[PDB]
């Protein structure tokens, strides 16, 4: 049962601190919760993804801290804690149940702060070059049942380091591995939804006033886009016509 408590007692926590200092008063109360869940928020190694599944919302709660920038600096151990621990486990190589952490707890890190790992997060584009190179074990096996959650929740984690590392444009020397993925995700199998959030983001990508330093990226990734057509699924396409379209109206 060992692990049961801990998704239960997550969810017993996050009403508990709901309410707790309702007007967020957790700011020097966090380092309680920080030694009541630190050997805790690294799960998802020892076990099953179900984990940080469940801490995903006491995480996401305990991130609304107020200001734990350059100004009170209670959690700024807590979150070169965690900010660490996803520098090391991104690092964790050879089983899909090693990396499942790096993705979700930077991730949430980046859904509520303009910061974000910026000065450490190359590995988890390593990581995505890791998951590119998954599109073989993807695609040769035919089926499921071999580890459903294996297919759906790595593919879900695909979701979330394409959001999360293609939203952001400050990125630094390494645009051409970026994008050159890309381009080998639209090559190869590749089902429909988890690519209309990038044709959805192609359109983030093409609208940026924004410098976005040179024109041919967008060129290079949207020739990408007339396999659409070749592929024999039809419906991905009228949205990369409608950004050609308004992409002509503008001049």
């Known amino acids: 049962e060992n692990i049961l408590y801990y998704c239960m007692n997550a969810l017993d926590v ?32 020892h076990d099953v993804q179900e984990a940080l599944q469940k801490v995903l919302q006491v995480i996401m709660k305990a991130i609304k801290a107020q200001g734990v920038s350059v100004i009170i600096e209670e959690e700024s151990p807590g979150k070169t804690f965690i900010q660490m621990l996803t520098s090391v486990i991104t690092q ?22 303009p910061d974000n790992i910026v000065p450490l997060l190359t590995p988890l584009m390593k990581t995505f070059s890791k998951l590119c190179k998954d599109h073989l074990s993807i695609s040769q096996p035919k089926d499921a049942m071999a580890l459903e959650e294996a297919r759906i929740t790595t593919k879900l984690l695909e979701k979330v380091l394409y959001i ?3 939203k952001v444009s400050l990125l630094g020397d390494s645009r051409r591995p970026f994008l050159s993925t ?38 290079a990734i949207l020739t990408k886009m007339l396999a659409f057509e070749i592929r024999g699924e039809p419906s991905l396409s009228k949205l990369f016509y409608e950004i050609v379209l308004k992409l002509f109206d503008q001049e």
């Not at 601190?17 to 309702?22: A, H, L, P």
């Not at 080998?184 to 990508?205: A, G, P, T």
């Open 182 to 219: 890309v381009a080998l995700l639209i090559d190869h199998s590749m089902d429909q939804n988890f690519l209309r959030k990038i044709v959805n983001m192609s359109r983030s990508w093409i609208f940026n006033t924004e410098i976005f330093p040179t024109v041919k990226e967008k060129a």
């Open 14 to 45: 996050l009403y508990v601190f709901f309410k707790n200092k309702t007007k967020e008063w957790i700011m020097e109360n966090l380092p309680t919760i920080q030694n009541l869940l630190e050997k805790c928020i690294k799960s998802d190694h």
């Open 164 to 166: 999360l590392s293609l």
């Open 92 to 113: 964790d190589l050879q089983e899909t149940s090693s990396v499942t952490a790096g993705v979700t707890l930077a991730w949430v890190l980046f859904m509520n702060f």
